[PDB]
Design a protein around this ligand. Structure first.
Ligand SMILES: NC(=O)C1=CN([C@@H]2O[C@H](COP(=O)(O)OP(=O)(O)OC[C@H]3O[C@@H](n4cnc5c(N)ncnc54)[C@H](OP(=O)(O)O)[C@@H]3O)[C@@H](O)[C@H]2O)C=CC1
Ligand SMILES: NC(=O)C1=CN([C@@H]2O[C@H](COP(=O)(O)OP(=O)(O)OC[C@H]3O[C@@H](n4cnc5c(N)ncnc54)[C@H](OP(=O)(O)O)[C@@H]3O)[C@@H](O)[C@H]2O)C=CC1
Ligand code: NI
Lengths: 485, 482
């Protein structure tokens, strides 16, 4: 493996020559040397994107769609490679990476499918002889900055859709997941997109990302990452007046009412709260249970969590949980655990950590002052709070700074709709996991969870703009100068 | 003169007042609040409290409220006209226009309130219904300019209200009385307390509070590009969304196949109406060489006819004053810079008090301040060009993206130019400032972020909520043993 940037149709070394050694979060073994890019690399890619822009944006939608279809067929051949890399570099299990690769395939196809169909409007004019219509135009070069947790699918959801609608792209993957980025670039290359239409530069955020965010020729930034970093990017984007899409994380309520199949509720709870070691923006990070089922629920949930198998994700396809992405995550989780213990929480199970591995720590007897109720816990530490009624459930659910997703388990149509209605989130799910995601549906939060929506036409929307154009067919008198005649 | 907060008119908490004066004769118009952070915070908390009640009711009830606002506005028309003239310096034709348009705006918000639709989606999963709902953003700050303070304020306010948001509104300091009249209208319409709030104070204090505050979900702003940039940056802190209208230097491109006389009348109206203080004003006129001489001749000929006077004098007055002495000073700089760079002054150049005559220039180039900057005032460059590519090159060479226009009878040239000009809006054979109440009004580049009017306003102030219901039980991948 020789991992490189990809700029203007060419796999290229960083101008610096710098390299970081990317190692596996699993055993710490070396994975590959990867670029450590600077501001000049970013600048090169940006200019490549700005020169490719006109040619790319002015061909008909169908041509771009043919490119995305080509991308799809290339990706299908690269599936196993993507999976291996997602497991080795990202710590994903077989099931996590299979799921992500499938979803990625779907995403690419989706952008392809929608490319020809993104429509403007024909309007009624309040004026006499006037054609009034509204066109969709692509924004420009779009910066795309992505996280390490689902680096493939998140990256591709932004890239594929942004490309489809006539934007070009410069893409900086997460520092912990460079090889995934590189592989995306291999796909785009093998698909033969025109040079400069898609550019990959692997480098540290404060350098590469900073340039992408401040550059004059960058039209838009779409960013999935930490909420603070997103506030930074948001503020710095204001200088050049570039728009932004920001997915800043969540702390999603999973609310289980008293009429549920409690065993089923526990199975669901375990999947939604702990999948990918809980590193999912839509993870069910706060579990809220009705007191009538609370004890039986807690006992069952813990029973199933106990069942989870944590191991090297390379071993076989049945491993439930691989490691956390890095040492920093384990440390942070240890902070959350320390906080909860010191605040009087019962640690029902887990907390054991070796290397980057962390066995899920479940807590009860928690209150709203716990760090794990007040912060997004991106990792395998879960509170379970007990509530007396639907109102309290809702109160606790909305008791966060986050807005992303949420879910309620119940068979009662009124309680389901009332809670759904009252929960403040960009997304809500009745009788499913908090992390439900489809390729074409608006995905995003309110509150501290972010700004904008992605997937399908919502992504098209983030990366295009309305252009109001009229044609006046008749001659008019004008109010000045009033002396006319 | 009365901030409006939580259903009542009241003093600012500082008690600090300020004298506001007519740009026309400089006479005293009213004493108005100088509000502080606390005033804003109070308006905001009131908006926030009123929010759940206002958002949750059916849209038809809000529409009803807007129809009441409509009825009241119709009663208050001459009050609004009067104030727009005396405090704003608008001529009778311009204030009549703004009022007629504001009426259409309120009616439009009311009309559309019941109609803003989410989507029903096809799901890729078995046994799941998947839909998307619209939801109001929250309390919304509305910060407006002095040039069209009524119609701009009301486009923002009415549409934001229609769709279930609460408003905290801080009018341009140069037009506080118009703000007050709006609050008067809202109060007489009887909207629930906290739904709409007016606080009159300085931008860096009241506006800063609005833009940095926790409970404000969104800010829609119309004003200086620099101020807009600041607001966009400070917005980041709380992750609040912004709509930003930052003005333009709109190209008006005149080709050689046009009726030249007509092209000139159009050009004069588009470039100079309301003393050229209009975001979509035709600020840079671009003529094809073949018609250029006769065009210039005729344009100047009509400019000659423009009556500047006390806009109170009568209904045929073409131009009133600028808004303040600062604008005169700036216009003076633009003219002096153009002359000093060897620009040929074809006509005008005199100022008195707040009045400034149209100053028209030719033989300019791209380094002139009147080509490089938004000239919000009656100073206009006319640039002669050899061909369409050059028309477009000059049209695009500017930081601004707002609007634009081309006069021509050739369909291909019209459409080539319309596509090539980088602007958020474009008009073939009409003025650059065409505006309808239901259209996506906004620019690109330095002209701003977002669109307003109709569903586009609703859009700036709402979000999509994806909701699913899953009807089948599922098997889960972890734990695998299970
Ligand atoms: O989830 P998680 O990935 O941890 O969330 P993060 O915010 O930590 O990561 C998200 C992305 O933002 C990048 N980043 C960090 N600082 C900046 C910046 N000033 N400008 C642009 N991008 C930046 C990161 O780059 P990187 O990963 O290289 O630090 C990463 O690609
Ligand atoms: O055109 P023109 O009206 O002259 O453009 P401006 O930007 O100067 O004015 C637009 C509006 O923004 C206000 N404003 C100025 N600074 C800020 C700020 N830091 N935060 C919030 N609002 C602000 C103005 O109030 P004000 O005029 O009172 O400063 C005005 O109401
Ligand atoms: Ni939008």
């Amino acid at each position: 493996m020789k991992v490189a940037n990809y700029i203007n149709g060419e796999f290229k070394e960083p101008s610096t020559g710098a390299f970081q050694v990317k190692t596996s979060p699993v055993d710490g073994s070396k994975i590959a040397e990867v670029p450590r890019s600077g501001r000049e690399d970013a600048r090169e890619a940006i200019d490549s994107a700005f020169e490719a822009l006109k040619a790319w944006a002015n061909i008909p939608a169908i041509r771009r769609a043919e490119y995305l279809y080509k991308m799809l067929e290339v990706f299908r051949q690269m599936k196993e490679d993507f999976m291996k890399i997602l497991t080795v570099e990202g710590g994903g299990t077989y099931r996590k990476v299979w799921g992500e690769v499938v979803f990625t395939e779907r995403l690419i196809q989706n952008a392809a499918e929608l490319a020809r169909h993104y429509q403007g409007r024909v309007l009624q004019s309040d004026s006499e002889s006037t054609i009034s219509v509204v066109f969709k135009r692509s924004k420009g070069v779009v910066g795309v900055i992505t996280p390490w947790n689902y680096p493939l699918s998140i990256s591709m959801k932004k890239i594929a859709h942004t490309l489809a609608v006539g934007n070009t792209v410069v893409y900086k993957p997460a520092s912990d997941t460079p090889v995934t980025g590189w592989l995306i670039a291999q796909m785009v290359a093998k698909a033969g997109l025109p040079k400069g239409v898609f550019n990959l530069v692997i480098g540290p955020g404060p350098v590469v990302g900073e340039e992408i965010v401040t550059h004059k020729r960058v039209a838009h930034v779409t960013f999935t990452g930490e909420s603070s970093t997103g506030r930074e990017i948001a503020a710095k984007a204001a200088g050049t007046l570039k728009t932004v899409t920001l997915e800043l994380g969540g702390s999603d309520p999973l609310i289980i009412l008293d009429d549920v199949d409690v065993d089923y509720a526990a199975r669901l709870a375990v999947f939604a709260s702990l999948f990918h070691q809980g590193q999912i923006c839509t993870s069910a990070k706060r579990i809220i249970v009705h007191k009538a089922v609370a004890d039986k629920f807690i006992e069952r949930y813990v029973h199933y969590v106990k069942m989870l198998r944590i191991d090297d994700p390379r071993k076989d396809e049945k491993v439930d949980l691989g490691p956390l992405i890095n040492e920093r995550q384990v440390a942070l989780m240890k902070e959350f655990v320390d906080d909860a213990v010191s605040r009087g929480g019962r640690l029902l199970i887990g907390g054991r950590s070796w290397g980057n591995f962390f066995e899920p720590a479940i807590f009860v007897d928690v209150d709203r002052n716990f760090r794990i109720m007040r912060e997004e816990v991106f990792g395998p530490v879960r509170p379970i709070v007990v509530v007396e009624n639907d109102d309290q459930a809702v109160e606790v659910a909305n008791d966060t700074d986050y807005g992303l997703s949420g879910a309620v388990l119940t068979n009662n149509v009124n309680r389901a709709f009332r809670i759904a209605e009252a929960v403040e989130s960009g997304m809500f799910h009745i009788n499913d996991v908090t992390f439900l995601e489809e390729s074409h549906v608006p995905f995003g939060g309110i509150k501290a969870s972010g700004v904008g929506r992605e997937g399908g036409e919502w992504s098209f929307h983030e990366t295009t703009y309305d252009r109001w154009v009229t044609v006046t067919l008749r001659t008019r008198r004008f109010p000045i100068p009033s002396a006319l005649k």
